[PDB]
Amino acid sequence: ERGYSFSLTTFSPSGKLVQIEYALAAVAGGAPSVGIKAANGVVLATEKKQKSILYDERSVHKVEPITKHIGLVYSGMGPDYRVLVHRARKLAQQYYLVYQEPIPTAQLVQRVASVMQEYTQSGGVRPFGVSLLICGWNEGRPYLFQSDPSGAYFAWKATAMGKNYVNGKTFLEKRYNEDLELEDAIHTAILTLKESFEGQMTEDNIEVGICNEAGFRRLTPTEVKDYLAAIA
Amino acid sequence: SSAGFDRHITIFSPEGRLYQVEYAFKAINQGGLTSVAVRGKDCAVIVTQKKVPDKLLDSSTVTHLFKITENIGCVMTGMTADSRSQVQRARYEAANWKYKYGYEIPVDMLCKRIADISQVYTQNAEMRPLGCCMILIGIDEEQGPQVYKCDPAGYYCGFKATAAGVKQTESTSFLEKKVKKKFDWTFEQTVETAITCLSTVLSIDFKPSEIEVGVVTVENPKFRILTEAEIDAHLVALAE
Amino acid sequence: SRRYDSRTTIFSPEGRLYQVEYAMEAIGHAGTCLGILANDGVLLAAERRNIHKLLDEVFFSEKIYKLNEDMACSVAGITSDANVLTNELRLIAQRYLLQYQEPIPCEQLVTALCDIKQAYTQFGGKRPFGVSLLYIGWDKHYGFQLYQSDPSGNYGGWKATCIGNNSAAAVSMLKQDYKEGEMTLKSALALAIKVLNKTMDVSKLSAEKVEIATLTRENGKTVIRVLKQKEVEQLIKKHEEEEAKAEREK
Amino acid sequence: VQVKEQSILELGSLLAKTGQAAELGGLLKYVRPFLNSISKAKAARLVRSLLDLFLDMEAATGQEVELCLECIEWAKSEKRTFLRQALEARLVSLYFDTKRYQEALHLGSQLLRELKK
Amino acid sequence: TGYDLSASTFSPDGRVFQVEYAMKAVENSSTAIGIRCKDGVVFGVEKLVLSKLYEEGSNKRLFNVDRHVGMAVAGLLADARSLADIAREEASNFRSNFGYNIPLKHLADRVAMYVHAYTLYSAVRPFGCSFMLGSYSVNDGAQLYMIDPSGVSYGYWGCAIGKARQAAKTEIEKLQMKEMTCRDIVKEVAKIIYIVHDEVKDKAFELELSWVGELTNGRHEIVPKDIREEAEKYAKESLK
């Protein structure tokens, strides 16, 4: 068959791209998320909620490992997340085949952003509807990055995304600093996620990921319950 | 709420939504049929209704149950042709996995591959996103029974009790009320609950010739369809 | 299929074509950049936009990009297309060097990129590139050089230019105060500081809100330096004190 | 391993129910070297679950001051700001019930500046 | 409006409109019935004579798909001929690949999938023919299937398509076709077509009858002339 071969994203009379704005508006309605780094590693926290008790909470995951030391979380549309995850895995594989070394974080961020940008200029397609957070630990210094449906990216110390992201950023403004440890970072991440959380926070509604110079991994529900207790 | 061609193809509306996909969800209800799936301690049951309005039609070829693989079974709802096409794609994909990797395919990988295939239709602006649903049941080593569901928007998940069709909401409510009690589950209990759910949602008190049942269990993982006689046996055993 | 098309290539009854015009209206906002040269060394000044309290400040460069051993360029507009274009011209320069074993002159590289940029405005039916950017460089043919691009496709050499939102005021002030063949790499910095002071609304010129890059010539080095934040502050305060003294004179 | 900590908690609860404090202080002294062998979350929760049960009973003159000070020291060693701040608040509240003049004043003034930020 | 111009736009209530328009295009065809006996099937078509200039035997609507499979069409002739050609090529391909005559349950499915492939995209239009496939085999008995332009195929004991489909099936159901051999079925088919399409609607017409079953040793062909003569002679007695 064939496609259409004409761009669906065009310039308005006021010099603005409408579709990117609508994609950002769709992103703003997703599940909230928070990300922090303090001098030793990075913490990614996200909130998950099944509609009823029928759903199995251990069947799918939000935090996904690209490789041994890169982590990624999302906010926005659901199905579009897997395509980006799969593409990132492929890209890391070609990099490792060519150079025989684990990929640096910045290169992976740049390549993923390039794909996401290219997806808004071709013909007969519509842009993605997610916003990503990427974390890693290479050569000692930890790294945190955030993407954008338009393809741009930034580097952050602490970031909040999803619903009520403005309140999260203001809250992090008066709390975060440049010298803490991973445990206190976890404490403040749960504290700031409690701002818009549900009535009762259980050990299964929350997913937490930690990166240190030992590798990326996803916290099991037991220690998540341990952290939820003795706090708040 | 709309501006331009957002009502005719799959692009974002100003509020951040897209309607060409949520129209398919209500296109599902055109068939007017309901199916239920229940998972037990060591077995899984799929039950559905069938309606034959005319005597001239041959009743032996109206089944909605399909044998995807000797160990994996499925049930469909919605438009018939789309469901048949999805069945064809699933069969081909399972056979290809067996050819390539040399061992049987897990059910979750199959569901993920199907959902990833379906997600493209809601990305490009020249196709229509196939208004038909998907329910699969299977047995996995070290896990036991598994029940998964897939939808036209590309969202797959794993459930413990599912209903798809016209009466989805109240059937899920009844199943939740039953499952909150946290009682032991065996084969007969699971089948009885699955049948009574549909019986009380529709309020029919039907006969052994108007439903279909499929079952899988850890004694012969082959997917099998119950014959009318043993279906009548369960039906009479249910009524004391 | 022809119902959903937007026809992003046809003309208009009045003679002009709209998409490039709308792109030029888009480049109007979002940033301020300028470039000046009069003797050994040429300088680029940029106005940083992302100035939030939580930025990690990596990569040692915000908007200044290196294209070759002796080529640097700034950019204004949508940043993703900027990444695309910079990556696209980098291998153009490298393939020229591979074929000829000689550093590429600036003019040819600019013309090649402009040809690629113009290709999208005549056939293909795709959205054009909304990015305009500067070029600074040195080569044995004509010494030091500055150039400016355009989403339409054309270009041109210059002696002092600005691109950002308040480009009109900057251009007027530049043409009011400039001298041909005398400004060394000591007065040009002061001129740029004064121009930026006028254009931006925020006074006192916080040193973290500006970025300066200079290119100078060595025996065989052609060193590009991005002067740090430890030298901007005394430059700003010197400007402030001399301005106060001059005003007090009147 | 974890069964040991579970039993420790249950025995502490039983000793609190019985109505004595010397054994509870002995229990607190008993496990201090042990604690540097498990997760930080469990260690913190056990420290809190022992301290609260010890303090919310009745006065024993010998043991109601040094325990809080050594907990402050341990929290400072472990670098946990919230834990040490909560324990400082508890300690400054505890000084007053012993009719103390100045040690319940300078501590609060020192903590005010940190809390206000 | 405008939701009913492409084949890739769901209407707000959630259904496709172009396929419904194809249906309404079918409902103006003449008539065609087909019923299965104890050991075969029998087709029957009434063909209208527009003007005296045309010759007998023109534009037959009873097509011969394969050496043991027959087809009867209704709708637009051009699309029907295209479908006949594609089915014929597919059957020959199957015989070449595997090595024996294709069963109905596979050929009907393949043609149905090919027809359904033309209802998703906006670059092509849906077909406009509804048709019936019939066959008989010694190892599988008699087989009858019906396929509609939307892409749906079912099995029947007896079916009718065209204008007065329901009127024909009314007298179809009165018959106890489950028992008799299809040697006396020809007379009742002739009778059931002469009891429809009043002479007020049109002046003259003609009858086309097919034949397949064990009586022909598996071959499919037109009935002998004398047998049809006797059949219509019997059917004329409905004037009583």
Test mutation, C4, C5, C6, chain B, max B CBs within 10 A: C4
Burial class (CB in 10 A: 0-12, 13-18, 19+), E43: buried
3-state secondary structure at position A210: strand
Which chains does chain A touch, 3 or more C-beta pairs < 8 A? B, C, D, E
From B123's Cα to the closest Cα of chain A, the distance in A is 6
Residue D90 contacts A where some CB pair is shorter than 8 Å = no
**Other CB atoms within 10 A of residue D40 CB:** 17
Q: What pairing do the DSSP bridges indicate for beta strands C42-47 and C210-215?
A: antiparallel
CATH number at residue A88: 3.60.20.10
Q: Do A230 and D45 touch (CB under 8 A)?
A: yes
Residues B82 and B94: their CA atoms lie apart, in Å, by: 18
Task: Give the domains, in start order, of chain C with CATH numbers.
Answer: 1-248 (3.60.20.10)
Residue given tokens 């043919």 in the structure block = C141
The amino acid present at B96, given as its one-letter code, is N
Nearest residue of A to residue E124, measured between CA atoms? A1
The 3-state secondary structure of E209-240 reads EEEEEHHHCCCEEECCHHHHHHHHHHHHHHHC
A2, A6, A150, A170, best to mutate vs chain C, most C CBs in 10 Å: A6
Contact A223 D41 (CB under 8 A): yes
Q: Comparing C-alpha atoms, which of B108, B139, B150, B143 is closest to residue B216?
A: B139
Total domains present in chain A: 1
Show Cβ contacts of residue A180 under 8 Å, excluding neighbours closer than 6 positions: A38, A39, A188
Asked whether A43 and A36 are in contact (CB, 8 A), the reply is yes
- Phi first, then psi, for residue E212 (nearest 5°) are -155, 150
Spatial separation of the C-alpha atoms in residues B96 and B101, rounded to whole Å: 9
Q: Which residue has the tokens 């040399």?
A: B102
Q: What is the DSSP letter of C62?
A: S
Shortest distance between the Cα of E6 and any Cα of chain A, in A, equals 15
Q: Nearest CA to CA, how far is C126 from chain B (Å)?
A: 16
Interface touch A59/B157, C-beta < 8 Å: yes
Facing residues of A71 across strands? A65, A135
Query: Could you report how far apart the first and last alpha carbons of chain A are, in Å?
Result: 59
Query: Within 10 Å of residue B61's Cβ, how many Cβ atoms?
Result: 12
Encoded amino acid at B93, one letter: E
Nearest CA in chain A to E121: A1
Interchain proximity A16–C56, CB inside 8 Å:
no
Rounded Cα–Cα distance for residues D82 and A232 (Å): 11
- Residues of chain A with C-beta less than 8 angstroms from the C-beta of E123: 1-2
For chain B, say whether A229 makes contact (Cβ under 8 Å): no
Q: Phi first, then psi: what are they for C61, rounded to 5°?
A: -160, 140
Structural domain boundaries, residue E147: 1-238
CATH number, domain containing residue E67? 3.60.20.10
Q: Which residue of C has its CA nearest to A38?
A: C56
Say yes or no for a CB contact (<8 Å) between B24 and E11. Answer: no
Looking at CA atoms only, how far is residue E128 from chain A in angstroms? 22
Phi and psi at B58, nearest 5°, equal -80, 115
Q: Report the distance separating Cα E128 and Cα E10, nearest Å.
A: 20
Helix ranges (DSSP H) in chain D: 2-18, 22-30, 32-35, 40-55, 66-78, 81-96, 106-116
Q: For chain E, how many structural domains are there in total? A: 1
Interface of D with A in 51-80 (CB under 8 A): 79-80
E195 CA to centre of own chain: 19
Distance CA B109, CA A33 (A): 28
- Put simply, whether C175 touches A (Cβ < 8 Å) is no
Query: Min CA distance, B181 vs chain A (Å)?
Result: 12
Please list every residue in chain B whose beta carbon sits closer than 8 Å to the beta carbon of residue C4.
Answer: 5, 8-9, 125
| Distance, CA of A137 to CA of A146 (rounded, Å) | 15
Q: Quick one: tokens of C50? A: 């992302």
Q: Which residues of C touch A156 (CB under 8 A)?
A: 54-56
Distance between CA B67 and CA B136 in Å, rounded? Answer: 10
* Cα distance between residue C79 and residue A153, in whole Å: 9
Chain E stretch 66-125, residues whose beta carbon is closer than 8 A to a beta carbon of chain A: 121, 123
Burial tier of A110 (Cβ tally within 10 Å: 0-12, 13-18, 19+): middle
Cβ within 8 Å of residue D77, ≥6 positions away: none
Among chain C residues, CA nearest to B5: C4
Q: Sort residue B193 into left (φ over 0), alpha (ψ -120 to 50) or beta.
A: alpha
User: Which of A1, A4, A5 to substitute to test the interface with E, most E CBs within 10 Å?
Assistant: A1
Q: Give the gap in angstroms from C-alpha C40 to the nearest C-alpha of chain A.
A: 35
- Single out the residue of A12, A21, A73, A15 nearest to residue A42, CA to CA: A73
Interface test with A, best of D81, D85, D115 (most A CBs within 10 A): D81
Alpha-carbon distance values, C141 to C103, C108, E142 (Å): 11, 12, 91
**Which residue of A121, A125, A153 is the best one to mutate when testing the C interface, meaning the one whose CB has the most C CBs within 10 A?**
A121
DSSP letter, residue C15: S
**Contact at 8 Å (CB) between B3 and A13?**
no
Asked whether the beta carbons of A141 and A23 are under 8 A apart, the reply is no
Contact check, Cβ <8 Å, B157/A55: yes
Task: Give A48's contacts in chain B (Cβ within 8 Å).
Answer: none
**Residues B147, B136: contact at Cβ < 8 Å?**
yes
Indicate the Cα dihedral angle C65, C71, C77, C82, nearest 10°: -60
Contact (CB, 8 A) for E189 and E31: no
Give how many domains chain B has, as a whole number.
1
Q: How many contacts does A have with D, using Cβ atoms within 8 A?
A: 22
User: Distance between CA atoms of C183 and C175, rounded to whole angstroms?
Assistant: 14
Does D42 sit within 8 Å of A226, measured CB to CB? yes
Cβ proximity of E134 and E185 under 8 Å: no
Contacts of D79 (CB under 8 A, 6+ apart): A181, A184
Record: contact C79-A152, CB cut-off 8 A = yes
Which residue segment(s) compose the domain that B205 sits in? 1-240
**Dihedral of alpha carbons B27, B31, B34, B37, sign:** negative
Residue-by-residue DSSP string for A85-148: HHHHHHHHHHHHHHHSSPPPHHHHHHHHHHHHHHTTTSBSB----EEEEEEEE-SSSEEEEE--
Question: Per the structure block, which two tokens stand in for E187?
Answer: 């007379």
A34, A131, B80 from A163: Cα distances, Å: 11, 12, 40
Q: How far apart are CA D87 and CA A206, in angstroms?
A: 28
Chain D: list its partners (3+ Cβ pairs within 8 Å): A
Name the 3-class secondary structure at A37.
strand
Kindly determine whether residue B9 and residue E9, on different chains, have CB atoms separated by under 8 Å: yes
Distance CA E158, CA E166 (A): 12
Chain B residues within 8 Å of chain C (Cβ atoms): 5, 8-9, 125
**The tokens of B115 are what?**
């959902």
Phi, psi of C72 (to 5 degrees): -135, 155
Which residues of chain B are within 8 Å of residue E156 when distances are taken between CB atoms?
A: 56-58
| Structural domain for A204, as ranges | 2-231
User: How far off is chain D from A174, nearest CA to CA, in Å?
Assistant: 8
Of B108, B153, B175, the CB nearest to A54: B175
Report resolution in angstroms: 3.6
What CATH number has the domain bearing residue B68? Answer: 3.60.20.10
Residue E158 contacts residue E177 (beta carbons within 8 Å): yes
- Other C-beta atoms within 10 Å of A41: how many? 19
**Nearest Cα residue to B55 out of C1, E159, C168:** E159
Q: What does the longest C-alpha to C-alpha distance in chain D come to?
A: 45
Q: Report chain A residues whose CB lies below 8 A from the CB of B158.
A: 55-56, 59-60
